[PDB]
């Protein structure tokens, strides 16, 4: 009993250390966009003279967004959308091109890197009002609708979006721009699934020299990362995982691991539900690892 | 009796490996907590550097006043309650003419007009500002061995993020031990200033104390040792915060932490004071910092586990 416990407790600690590393990685975009939101809300917060604390034009705000992309290579992008006439009169900017404005002048910049890496901007006019469901079960405008409805930060499950002519699966990290209790807009950043897959492959290598495999499962059950096969990213976990596993995914409470042994295959399954800063999201790190890679010392002792 | 030697060594190994795993988990949580202030102030730097970066037309990408930059700093304090403060210093005449501001009080300016705001919370929790005029140019060694202006001198010298070992500063009439998280404000390859935020040692101590209560049910202790060997945290004794780890450790321990590779664990077993010590050095992002987590476990607690392990094995 006690020996198996001490071995199991090592396994869980090492897995917990990797959850913490993934959390650090996934909390970073939210902290970045929190900063932009805490600066941009000052456009609508009066100071001692009764005028906004920050008197930045739209071009200066976009400069902040562009600087974010330039100086955070791990972020796929940075984007901001204001409510209609949130901080100025949309109609005065309608028809101005190349600045991220909707046709009616709404402020909707999406900044990302062109082919040569230099930041470019697109208006989000097409997606910001779209409530259509993307192929991964995510509402097209969820990155904006979620902060608007909840007035809190939102991390969005994997969804495909077209970026410079290619389809990129990504997850968004979003914070509302609040002036008092008024939702004025939202600012966010995406991480690509390719980036997060690379993170999870690194994490899995730290567990018994990569003897096992890991999966990162979003709140809707779809795969953010899956070290076994890059082709499964964005798929329902139920379409990759064996019945034993997709069952245990429903047996989970945040921060409490679930530990199981698949008898037919002789491996350990470890499920570590976790959350990310103030986003309220519940993702799950799953570890699948052969018993032999973990319990060799027990085996050695029983050999004596 | 060889078998007994082989069996005991193997039982000890499983215990030793578990504690190493717990130390790695604790280091990973510490890294998560300590990366956060650097990301915040990187955002401040990435906005403020726009005051000197040219746009398409030549004029600067951000035309914001000192008041507006201070509003960004105040907003950071207000909205980041884990942070003790937020502060920024510009080179002389970095983004404007200091002399136009010389003499103006209550805005965080030096006597000569240099921009040097230090924003923190008053007793009512609302942010207030102090100029860093007395510290920004002082290389005096503070009681913890840190230069008074290291928070600025290190980003200036190295042009990269800097995390500073514990140092005391007067805030609101009281001496507070803190560690700063600093980044340079670069326009191109030119240092124009730096921006930073402090965490109090009280905050880090509290973190480590809460974690120690989950290690052998609080029976042991933890410490965090800064790059110069002084205590960032020490769960046993609040009064050692800032003190040399060598002052509270009876072995050769702190000396050959210098010789230990980042992310390599090292046990030091002292049967004489009944202590098992585990050191795990680590770094934080690209700061270059070298801090060490220490776990201290009563030997008798591990001795007791070995007995139960040995017995359970003998029973079956
Ligand atoms: C990709 N958008 C920027 C359009 C939304 C966030 O994923
Ligand atoms: C919306 N207002 C700017 C009027 C309130 C600020 O708190
Ligand atoms: C306390 N200061 C802000 C003066 C320096 C950073 O520790």
């Amino acid at each position: 009993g006690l020996l198996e416990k001490v071995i199991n407790e090592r396994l869980v600690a090492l897995a917990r250390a990797q959850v913490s590393q993934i959390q650090r990685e996934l909390e970073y975009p939210l902290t970045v966009v929190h900063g932009l939101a805490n600066s941009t809300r000052l456009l609508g917060e009066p100071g001692a003279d009764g005028m906004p604390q920050l008197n930045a034009s739209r071009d200066e705000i976009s400069a902040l967004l562009r600087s974010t992309v330039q100086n955070n290579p791990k972020l796929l992008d940075t984007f901001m959308a204001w409510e209609p006439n949130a901080f100025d009169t949309d109609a005065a900017f309608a028809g101005q091109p190349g600045k991220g404005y909707g046709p009616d002048g709404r402020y909707l910049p999406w900044w990302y890197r062109g082919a040569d890496g230099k930041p470019i901007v697109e208006a989000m006019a097409d997606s910001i009002d779209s409530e259509k469901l993307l192929p991964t079960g995510v509402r097209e405008n969820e990155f904006y609708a979620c902060p608007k409805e909840n007035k809190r930060p939102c991390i969005i499950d994997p969804a495909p979006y077209e970026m410079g002519g290619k389809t990129v699966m990504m997850s968004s990290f979003n914070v509302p721009i609040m002036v008092g209790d008024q939702f004025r807009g939202a600012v966010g950043a995406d991480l690509s699934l390719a980036f997060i897959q690379d993170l999870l492959k690194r994490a899995d290598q730290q567990l018994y020299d990569g003897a096992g495999e890991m999966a990162l499962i979003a709140s809707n059950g779809r795969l953010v990362a899956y070290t076994r096969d890059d082709s499964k990213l964005g798929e329902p976990a139920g379409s990759v995982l064996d019945g034993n596993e997709v069952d245990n995914l429903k047996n989970l409470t945040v921060d409490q691991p679930l530990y199981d042994i698949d008898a037919e295959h002789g491996h350990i399954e470890l499920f570590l539900p976790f959350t990310i800063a103030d986003s309220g999201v519940r993702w799950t790190l799953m570890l699948q690892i052969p018993q032999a890679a973990v319990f060799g010392e027990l085996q050695q002792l029983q050999g004596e």
Side-chain angles (χ1 to χ4, degrees), chain A:
Chain A
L2 176 49
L3 185 62
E4 283 186 54
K5 184 192 50 34
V6 180
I7 290 168
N8 276 338
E9 288 176 342
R10 179 194 183 189
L11 167 58
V12 171
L14 293 175
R16 281 201 200 265
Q18 287 321 304
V19 171
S20 290
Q21 292 287 335
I22 288 156
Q23 285 173 304
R24 182 185 56 63
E25 300 277 353
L26 299 180
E27 278 165 3
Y28 153 71
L30 223 52
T31 300
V32 171
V33 298
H34 266 300
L36 297 167
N38 291 331
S39 300
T40 307
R41 68 199 297 166
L42 297 175
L43 293 178
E45 305 261 26
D49 61 354
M51 293 302 234
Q53 285 182 49
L54 180 69
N55 188 46
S57 65
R58 288 179 176 214
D59 283 352
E60 287 168 308
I61 293 296
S62 275
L64 301 181
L65 301 176
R66 178 171 65 244
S67 176
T68 305
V69 173
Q70 187 65 52
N71 293 295
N72 293 271
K74 298 172 165 93
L75 301 180
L76 193 64
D77 60 26
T78 302
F79 53 92
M80 191 170 274
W82 293 350
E83 286 283 271
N85 319 299
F87 295 115
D88 55 28
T89 303
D90 283 350
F93 307 88
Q96 307 201 8
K99 309 271 213 190
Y101 305 160
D104 63 338
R106 192 173 175 192
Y107 189 61
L108 305 168
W110 179 18
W111 285 92
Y112 60 87
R113 301 179 196 83
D116 56 16
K118 292 189 275 173
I120 58 174
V121 60
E122 176 180 331
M124 292 185 288
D126 261 14
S127 56
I128 198 73
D129 294 314
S130 172
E131 283 216 58
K132 298 231 170 250
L133 268 195
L134 306 176
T136 51
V138 171
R139 187 160 40 139
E140 182 160 1
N141 74 347
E142 191 74 39
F143 66 94
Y144 188 84
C146 182
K148 178 182 201 154
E149 313 177 343
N150 299 102
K151 305 185 184 0
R152 63 118 162 97
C154 293
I155 294 167
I156 301 314
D157 296 337
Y161 290 88
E162 301 295 305
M163 282 192 90
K166 69 176 179 181
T167 306
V168 184
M169 277 291 316
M170 70 198 58
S171 276
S172 63
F173 300 76
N174 308 281
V175 176
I177 301 165
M178 301 296 304
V179 170
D181 50 72
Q182 298 173 0
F183 177 85
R184 296 284 186 94
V187 45
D190 293 293
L191 290 182
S192 75
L193 256 52
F195 175 80
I196 300 168
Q197 176 80 338
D198 184 77
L199 285 181
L200 197 62
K201 281 159 167 177
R202 293 182 177 275
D204 191 48
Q205 288 305 316
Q206 303 288 91
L207 271 281
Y208 302 83
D209 303 311
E213 304 286 346
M214 285 167 165
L216 193 56
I217 303 146
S219 82
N220 67 357
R222 292 198 164 246
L223 294 160
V224 193
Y226 187 68
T227 60
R228 221 177 318 241
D229 185 349
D230 305 320
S231 65
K232 303 269 166 229
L233 295 184
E235 309 269 83
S239 305
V240 191
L241 296 193
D242 276 343
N244 205 293
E245 286 131 329
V246 47
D247 267 276
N248 286 330
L249 276 183
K250 284 317 158 304
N251 199 304
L252 291 192
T253 36
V254 47
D255 187 66
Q256 307 311 318
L258 170 155
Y259 175 107
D260 201 344
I261 305 285
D262 217 288
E264 207 39 35
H265 295 79
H267 53 211
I268 301 161
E269 284 152 8
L270 192 58
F271 298 80
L272 293 100
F274 69 93
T275 192
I276 300 168
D278 48 353
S279 78
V281 66
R282 219 293 298 289
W283 284 11
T284 306
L285 171 71
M286 182 200 320
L287 173 57
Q288 168 150 204
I289 190 169
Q291 289 186 287
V294 175
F295 280 101
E297 293 152 323
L298 187 171
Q299 191 189 3
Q300 208 176 328
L301 286 151
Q302 291 180 336
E304 295 195 276

